[PDB]
Design a protein around this nucleic acid. Sequence first.
RNA 1: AUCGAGAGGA
DNA 2: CGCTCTGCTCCTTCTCCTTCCTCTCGATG
DNA 3: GGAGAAGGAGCAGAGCG
Lengths: 81, 112, 650, 171, 97, 142, 36, 262
Amino acid sequence: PKDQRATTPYMTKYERARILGTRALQISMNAPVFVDLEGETDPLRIAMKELAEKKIPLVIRRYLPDGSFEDWSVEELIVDL
Amino acid sequence: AGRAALYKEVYNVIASDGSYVNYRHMALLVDVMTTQGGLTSVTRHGFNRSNTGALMRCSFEETVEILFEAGASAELDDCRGVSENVILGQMAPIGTGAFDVMIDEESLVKYM
Amino acid sequence: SAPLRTVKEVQFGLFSPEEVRAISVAKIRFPETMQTRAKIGGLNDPRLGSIDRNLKCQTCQEGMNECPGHFGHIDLAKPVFHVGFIAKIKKVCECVCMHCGKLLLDEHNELMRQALAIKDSKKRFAAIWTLCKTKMVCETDVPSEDDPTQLVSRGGCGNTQPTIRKDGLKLVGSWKKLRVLSTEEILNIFKHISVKDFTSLGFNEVFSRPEWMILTCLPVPPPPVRPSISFNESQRGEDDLTFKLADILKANISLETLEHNGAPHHAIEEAESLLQFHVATYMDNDIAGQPQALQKSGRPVKSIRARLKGKEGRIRGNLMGKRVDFSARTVISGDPNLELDQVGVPKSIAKTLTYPEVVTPYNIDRLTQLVRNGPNEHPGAKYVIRDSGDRIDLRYSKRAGDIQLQYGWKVERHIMDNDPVLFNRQPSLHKMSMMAHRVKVIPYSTFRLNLSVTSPYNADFDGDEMNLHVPQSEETRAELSQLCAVPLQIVSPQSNKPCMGIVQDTLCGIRKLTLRDTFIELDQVLNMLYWVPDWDGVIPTPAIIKPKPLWSGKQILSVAIPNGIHLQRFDEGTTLLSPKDNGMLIIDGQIIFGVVEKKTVGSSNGGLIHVVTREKGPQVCAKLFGNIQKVVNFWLLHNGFSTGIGDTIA
Amino acid sequence: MFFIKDLSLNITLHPSFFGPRMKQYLKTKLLEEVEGSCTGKFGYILCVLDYDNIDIQRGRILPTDGSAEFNVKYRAVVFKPFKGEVVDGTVVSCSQHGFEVQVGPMKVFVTKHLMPQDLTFNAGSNPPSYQSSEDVITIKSRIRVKIEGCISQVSSIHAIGSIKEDYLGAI
Amino acid sequence: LRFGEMERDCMIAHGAASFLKERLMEASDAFRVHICGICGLMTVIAKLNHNQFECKGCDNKIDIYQIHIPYAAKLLFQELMAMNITPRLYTDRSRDF
Amino acid sequence: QINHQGEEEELIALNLSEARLVIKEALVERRRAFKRSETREKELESIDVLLEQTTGGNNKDLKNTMQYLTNFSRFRDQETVGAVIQLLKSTGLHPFEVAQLGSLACDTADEAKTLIPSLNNKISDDELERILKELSNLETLY
Amino acid sequence: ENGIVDQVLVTTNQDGLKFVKVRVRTTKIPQIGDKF
Amino acid sequence: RLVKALEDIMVHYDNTTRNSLGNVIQFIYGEDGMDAAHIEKQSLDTIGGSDAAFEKRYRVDLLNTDHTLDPSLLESGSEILGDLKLQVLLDEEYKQLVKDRKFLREVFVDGEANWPLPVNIRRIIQNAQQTFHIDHTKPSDLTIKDIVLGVKDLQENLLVLRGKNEIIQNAQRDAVTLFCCLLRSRLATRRVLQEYRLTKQAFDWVLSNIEAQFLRSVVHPGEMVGVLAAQSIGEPATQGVPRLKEILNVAKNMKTPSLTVY
RNA sequence: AUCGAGAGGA
DNA sequence: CGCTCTGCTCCTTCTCCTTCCTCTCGATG
DNA sequence: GGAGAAGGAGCAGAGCG
Ligand SMILES: [Mg+2]
Ligand SMILES: [Zn+2]
Ligand SMILES: [Zn+2]
Ligand SMILES: [Zn+2]
C-alpha cells in the first residue's frame, strides 16, 4: 500500500539506532563502503557519516497492529535526530 | 465514571507525599485496570486472569498451576509478548525490535 | 547445515501415550543404575544423555557439548492420575454421563446453548460445569423445549450419577441409593466421549484429549535434566529425580510382580496406591493432604514442581534473570575531572574484560600492535580467533609476535578508551538507574564517576557498589550510545524536569562565584579561563579597568556557557535592577543578573540545564557540566570553604 | 507431468558480497539452487522460466549478523507424476527382474510382478532383453510404462512402470 | 553477576532489544538444538558427521531446523515433557494476514 | 494454482512437447542473459548446444532427460502445437487431462478411453473421433 | 591472597587423625576506597 | 507486581496503545500522543483575569476608539484603521478566543492556568527577540492579515496523525485542541504587535520553528510506555502507601471509607 | 559440591 | 393451603499466598 | 493469618396440587 502510507515521514529514534548499528556491522564485515574515507576507522562513525548524507540502501518495514506493513526507504525518511 | 474517580483518588496519594508524576504515566495505569469492563486488580486474581499468552502468565506468581491449564485447553501462545520472547531468547517485538529492517535492492542498484 | 528459523508460535497439549512410546529410544526396566563403570541397558544407558567422554548420546557423539539427552519409556502396570489434572478430571467426570460417553445435558436445553455460544473455551467449560454438575441423572427421554409433550431419547444409560469426591489421590463416587471409583472405569469413559463433546468441554482432539489426563506411560528425562553428581570422592548421590524414578520403578515392578504372582487382590490395591503416590509426589511433592515424600536423608523429596515453582526456580531464577559474563562490580568514587558520559575503570578490570573486535583493512594495523602487547600489558588482547574457530590463547604462547592477522578474524581486544559500557546500581529502581557511559582507564581499583551523575543513580560514595556490563557486538555498542547514553536522559520523563545538576560543593561555589562582590585578580582569571576546555583563546575585557584590572565572577562563569543562550527568570524583587541580586537573566551566553543557585543550575525545569539541552542538543549540554564543575572547583579550591561550631552558635 | 509455477526459494548471502553486483550474484545462486531439485510436493524441478525479472522482494537482513535472506520468487518448470499414468519412456538400464526407464526427469523401475506373465528374461540377448513375448524391452528400444503410483524417496523420486496392459507397452 | 528482573525491565524501558538479547543469549546459555516440523519437540537425531536427521515417531527427515535457545529454556521444555506437557514449537505463524 | 504475484493462475498442465518448446525458449532467454553479461534429431542437438553454451556439462542427467524427451516428441513444431491447443480448449477440456492427450499418442476415441480411465466415463466420443484423427494426421507429418 | 606463612601448626584430634593449620599474614595498607 | 501488569503495553506506529493481545487501551497515547520528555509547565493566559482585562489584552478594533490599534506599532497606520475586511478577521479571532476562554473554564473548573504543554512558546518568542536584536523602538512591517493567516496555517500543520479519513482527521482536531488554544492565546495580534514587536522576517521564523520543534516532540512509536509508566509510579512508592497497596489491590474492604457531600 | 543455618554489607 | 420446587441466603471450610553481593559454618548421601 | 475461593446448608417464597 505504498500510496497513502499512514505513518510518519520522520525517522523514529529506534530506527536511527538500529540502522546505525547494522550499517556499522556490515562495514566491520569488510562490506563495500559508499563514501570516501577521512580516516574514521570507527565503523560506527562511518555509519553516522553515511546516514547524514543518505547513502544507506535500507528500507524500514513498519508493522501495523493487524500485521500489515509499510515500506519507508531511508532516503525517504526525514532524519530529525 | 469510576475510572475518573480512581485516577483522582490515586492522585491524592501521590500528591500527598509531595512527589510529582506526569499525567501520562498515571492515566495509562488507571485505563488498563478498567479496559476489561471492570475494576481488574493487578493481583494474582486480576491481571493474571487475563487472556494473554500463558507463557507470559506463568511467570507472574503462579507457574505450574497455569501450565497445567494450557495443556488442558491446548493453548497456542502467539509470542507477541515481551517476556515470551525473552524466555525463548528471541528479539522481543519492541523498541528497536518493533519493526523490521529490509534491504532496498532497488536503491542499492541506484547507487554505483 | 540444516535450515535456521525462529520461534513464532508455541502449541501446548498433552502427550499421546503411543506418541510417547514412539518418541522414546529406550524402555526403562531396572530401578538399578549399575558393574563398576557399565550402565544397565534398562536405565541410564548410553542411548540416553551419556556421561562425559561417552560419545554415544544415542549415536549422537559430540559429548554433552552439542547434544542433549533423549527420553526413556516406562510402561505403567496400571493407569494413574495426573496430579495437576485431578480437579480437572473431577469436574469433567461430573459432566459426562458416567459410562455413556455423552454429556448430562444437551443443546435442547437453552442454558447450554448459551454456554456453547461462549467463544472462550475456558469460560465455556466452567459455564457448562455449573449446569451439568447439578444434573444427577441422564434419563434417556428429555422433553423438548419446543414441544414439551415430545421427548428426545438421548441419554444412553438412562441411570443416575454418583456424587464425586476428591479422596486424596483417588476419586470416590457417592451413588444416590457409594463406592470408590476405578481409574480404569474413568479411562474407558473418556475413551467413549465424542469429539463434539471435546469442543464443549474445551478439549483439543489432536493436542488435548481428556483420556490423556490419565497416565499410562511415563517419559524418562535424560541425565542432563537430572545431572550425574560427583560432588564427593566419586560419590553419586544422584539427583532426587534419579532416586525418585527408582522408587516408581521398584513400585512398578512390585505391582506387576504381585499381580502376576498369585494375584493377591488386596496387596495389589495398596501397591497401586503406592504407585499413584510415588508418581504424584514425583510430579508434585506438595499436596493439600498430609503425604510428603521424604528422601532417605530425611529431607523432603525435591519434585519437578519444586524445580520450576517459586523464586530461583527454573523460570524466574534462570530465564527472566541469570548470571552473565563480561561484567564487573566494585566500589565507586567521585572525580570532578571526568565528564558525565565518562567513567574511570581500573587497569586491572580492562586487562580482563575483552571485546571481540573484527579485523578489517581499517584497523588491522592497530589490532596487530595490541596482539604484540599481549594479555600482560593493558593495551592488548587475550585471544586471537581465526575464521576456522581457532581460539588461540596468547596467554600460553609466544606466538603473539608471530601470528599474522587475516581479515574476518576476531580479536578479544581489551577494553579501551571511549568504548561504551553499561552501568547499573542495585537496586535498579527505574530507568535512570541504568545508563551508558564512555570508558577512560585509570591506575587505581575503583570506579570514578562525575559528581553530577550520582543523583539519578541515587548513589553515594559511602561505600556503595555498582555493576558494569560490556556489550559484545557492534550492533549493541551502537544501540547503547544512541538510546542509553548519559546525556540523552538529562531530561527525565519521570517529572518533566532535568534529573541532573550541580550538587554538593560545586553548587556552593557557584553562589559565591557569582555573588555580586566576588572579584577576581588577573592572575586567577588567566588560569580559570584555561581550565575551560571550550575557551576560544580570547580574554574578555575586565569589568573594572582604571583602578586595577578586575573581573567580576559573573564575567568568567559566562565563558563556560555557550553562545546563543537566553534565559529570563524574574522573582518578586526582580525589576531590571534586582537590589537583592535575585532572579536571573542570561543573554547570548552572558550573565547579567541574579546569583546562580539551585533554581538556575539545579533540577528545576526552568533552570539553565533544561534550556541548553533544547537549544543545542544533549551532546552540547553534557560538555557544559564539565565546564561548570571544572571552573568553579578550581576557584573554590583557591577560595576554600568550611563550617564549624560557630556556624551553629547564635 | 510438466508444470509451470511461480515458486520461490530462500537464499542467504554473506555481507562481503553486498555490493550492487549482488543482484546478479543472487540471480546465479538462485539458478544453481533451483535447477536440479527433487521434491515430493513438486516432484523434480527442471528449469526456471523467465530467467530475467528476478523477484528479490527486498532483502531480509538478520539481527544475528550481516547475513540476509531472500525469498526469491520464480517461475519454474517441474515434473510431477501421478498414479496410473501412461508415459512413453526409455530403458536406461536392464535387469533380470525388470527394467529401469527414464520418465521425464524421473526414474521408473519396471517390476516383474507387473509385466505380461508370458514375457521372460532372455539373458542370451545383447543387451539381455526380454524376448519370450511380444513386449520386447531393451536399453536401446522404446518403451511405454504405466505409472502405478509414485514411490517418492528421501534422496530421489521414482515410480512403478507397469507393462501388463493392452496399452502402455513396449514401444 | 545476575542480570536480574529489575535490570531487564530498564532495557525494556530503553527498548534495547538488541542488547537485551545479547545479554541473555551470547553472554550465557547459548545452545543450538534441532526440532521437528511435524511435532514441535526437540526429538531430532542429529548425525552431524552424516548430515542425517530424523524424528522417530514422525519418521520425518526433511523438516529439521536449527534454533538457538537458552540452555535453561531447553531444560524447561524437557522438564515439561517429563511433566506430560507437549511444548510444541512452530516456526510458521498460523495466521497469515 | 496461484503465482507469487498474487494472481490465481490456473494449474498449467504443460504438454510434453509444448514443455520442451517452452524449455527451448527459456534456454534461449538464458543464453541471451549470458550474452548480455523441426525434427527430433535437429531439436535434440540444437538444445544440447544451448545446454553446453549455458552450463558447464555437469548436469548430464538433464541433458539425457531432454534428449529422451525430444525422442518421444509428438509436436516438435510450435505453430502446430498451437493448433492442438485450440482444438482441445474449445471443448472445455480439463487442463490436467489436456496434458496427456498432447503428450501421448492416440488414434481412436476408444484407445484414449483405454489409455485414460478418466475419459472413459464422461467424455463425448464424437469430440475424440474428429479431433484424434486430425491430430493423428498431424503427428504422422513428423 | 598474598602474604607469608606465619605459623604452621600440626597436631591430631583424639582419633589420631593428623591436623594441619597454617596461618598466613599480610599487611593491609589503606587504599583508595577503603571505608572509614 | 506493577511491572508485570504493564510489560507488554507499547505504542504502535498507528499512534495507539495496545497490549500484547492487540487490545487497544488508549487510542492516542495519554490522550495527546505527546512524549512526556518534551513537555513542560506553561501558563494559559486566557483563563485568568477579569473579562474586561481579557478583552483589553486581546480585543482590537480598527473602527472605534476603545480598542484602536496604535499606528506607531506598524509601518502601516491609518491604512489599517477603518479596514472592515481586516476588522472581520480580528472579529473572528476575538470571538475564537472568547470561546476558548469559556471553553477552558469548563476544562479546568478550578481556574488553574498552569499545565504541562509541549513546545515552550515564550522561550521561542524571547529567542526571536535576541536573534538579530529586534529594534523594538521602530514600527514593524507586520500586517494583521499576515498574523491571522499565520496562526491558522500553523494549526493546519500540527499533524499528530496521518490518516486522511474523517475519523482520523476528527481525532487530530481533538488531540491538539488544548495546545492550539495556547497558540491562539500567546499569538494574539494585539500582543504580537504590542508585547513582542516582531518583524515580518522574525515572525516567519517563529512559526516555522514552532512547527519544527513540535514534530520532534511527538511521542515516538515503539515506546515501551507501560514499563516507563510502571517505574514512574514505582519510585514515588519507595519514598499513604498502605493506601496505595489498598488501591492497586482492589480490596473492596477499604480501611477508611468516607463521603464528601456538597 | 549442594542443601541447611547463621553473620554482614549495598 | 399444603407441597414442592428453586433459587436465595447463609455458613463454614479451605487454600496461599512477598532488590543485590560477601563471607563462614556444620552436616549430610 | 489473610485473603479469596468453595462448597454445603438452610430457608423462604413462589408456583403447584
Ligand atoms: Mg549509600
Ligand atoms: Zn543426545
Ligand atoms: Zn449414562
Ligand atoms: Zn516429530
